[PDB]
Amino acid sequence: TLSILVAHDLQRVIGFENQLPWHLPNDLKHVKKLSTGHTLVMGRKTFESIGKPLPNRRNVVLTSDTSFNVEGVDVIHSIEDIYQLPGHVFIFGGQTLFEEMIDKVDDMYITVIEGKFRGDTFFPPYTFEDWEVASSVEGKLDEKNTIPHTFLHLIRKK
């Protein structure tokens, strides 16, 4: 089973200068709950962004660098390797990977950040004609989590 996992804002910004443009603890917890015990797949730049692999799940990095050999990371070198990985695989980032996968994945777990940020990376446009809302749940706001946001689970129609 193959899912996208992503947070994008009202204009589908996902990234600025190789970071997330927002501080949102609730979203990162969301990620941890979903992906813990399973597999992440991510592109090189995204890994450099997180910098080490996430504990307690199988971290996998897509890169062309056949020199790449990082402790605690599986490495793959084509897209087509993804379909070999067993279990629940999450496509984790970033823009290049989403672009390449969005047409391929079963479903997407999207956090809509209900704001407009400055970005330099974007999620590809998509249509609800194509995507059934299996659930939609407002994140809770609070002293520490102050941007409105919604957890969407979308499943490919038809």
Ligand X SMILES: COc1cc(Cc2cnc(N)nc2N)c2c(c1OC)O[C@H](C1CC1)C=C2
| Residues near ligand NDP (CB under 6 A) | 6-7, 14-15, 18-20, 42-46, 49, 62-65, 77-79, 93-97, 100, 121
CB 140 within 8 A of CB 30: no
Which C-beta is closer to ligand X: that of 35 or that of 75? 35
Is the CB of 36 or the CB of 129 nearer to ligand X?
Answer: 36
Q: Given its phi and psi angles, is residue 87 left (phi above 0), alpha (psi -120 to 50 degrees) or beta?
A: left
Supply 42's token pair. 């991510």
131-138 sheet: strands from edge to edge = 73-76, 58-62, 39-43, 89-93, 2-9, 107-113, 149-156, 131-138
Closest approach, Cβ 65 to ligand NDP, in A, equals 5
Minimum distance of ligand X from residue 110's CB (angstroms): 8
Name the residues that contact ligand X, by CB under 6 A. Answer: 5-7, 19-20, 27-28, 31, 46, 49-50, 54, 92-93, 111
